[PDB]
Amino acid sequence: LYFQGETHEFTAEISQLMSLIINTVYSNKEIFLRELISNASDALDKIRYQALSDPSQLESEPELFIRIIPQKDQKVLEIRDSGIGMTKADLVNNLGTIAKSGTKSFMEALSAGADVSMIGQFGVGFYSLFLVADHVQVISKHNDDEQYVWESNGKFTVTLDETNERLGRGTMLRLFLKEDQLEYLEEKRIKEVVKKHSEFVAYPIQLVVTKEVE
Ligand SMILES: COc1ccc(CO/N=C2/C=C/C=C\[C@H]3O[C@@H]3C[C@@H](C)OC(=O)c3c(O)cc(O)cc3C2)cc1
């Protein structure tokens, strides 16, 4: 169903090319944020749905939200949602994996100069993160599993989370931004991008800003 079956061994070189392709094809780099919000919206839909039959699934994190937390000190942009979350197996599948179907369609679409604006539907959207970031940490907690951290920059690694604060449920993406892409820690820019590709989202998109007072 996906490239290299599922397993990812001695294939760091591929991540560079996909990153190089996506960095060359997508000159408007703000679309990484649109894909994050779209991923988070889908995650919230799934837990809301399965909470209709079994409302006890919402007790881990009662509220359903998307939250963007720019960390100016650490040069990190954090995007958290309270969706269904990801087990260890789910993290390995969704993160860093390529689908032969999507890539073949993506590559072929590039050949004919066809509309590739919607990156998510080629199963390749993961590497849009590397448009703005040099490293990525994914913290996730699924009701049926413990909290795990997936991170790469590349070598993939899923580590049991024994340090970060506890998420009730859901996923947090920590983006270590490139030195030229720090514009995405600023409030104005974030609202600009969110306002663009977020009209149709049914969940609140919250922005946490720390400003000094005069
Ligand atoms: C910035 O661009 C990209 C980042 C990562 C990827 C590859 O990970 N793909 C994802 C798929 C999301 C689509 C539907 C989901 O409801 C299912 C729950 C679970 C499977 O998904 C998530 O928890 C989740 C999230 O809450 C939040 C996320 O940001 C991602 C993801 C994980 C692709 C693009």
Resolution of this model in Å is 2.6
CA–chain centroid gap for 3, Å, is: 20
The CA distance from 90 to 107, in Å, is 26
Q: What share of the chain is helix, strand, coil (3-state, %, to 5)?
A: 40, 20, 40
122 and 106 Cβ atoms separated by less than 8 Å: yes
175 and 136 Cβ atoms separated by less than 8 Å: yes
68 and 78 Cβ atoms separated by less than 8 Å: yes
Task: State the virtual CA torsion across 176, 79, 128, 135 in degrees, nearest 10.
Answer: 20
171 lines ligand 1 (CB under 6 A): yes
Tell me the CATH number at 124.
3.30.565.10
The CA distance from 69 to 81, in Å, is 11
**Antiparallel, parallel or unpaired: β 76-81 and 170-177:** antiparallel
35 lines ligand 1 (CB under 6 A): yes
Locate tokens 């009701």: which residue?
Answer: 143
Atom index in ligand 1 nearest the CA of residue 173 equals 29
Locate tokens 């939250």: which residue?
Answer: 67
102 lines ligand 1 (CB under 6 A): no
Instruction: Return the closest-CA partner of residue 104 out of 194, 3, 205.
Output: 3
Enter the tokens of residue 116.
């590739």
Hey, whose CA ends up nearest to atom 25 of ligand 1?
40
Q: How many domains does the chain have?
A: 1
Hey, whose CA ends up nearest to atom 13 of ligand 1?
39
Enclosing domain of residue 10: 1-214
46 lines ligand 1 (CB under 6 A): yes
Task: State the virtual CA torsion across 209, 139, 97, 130 in degrees, nearest 10.
Answer: 30
- Which structural technique was applied? X-ray
For residue 113, what is the DSSP state? T
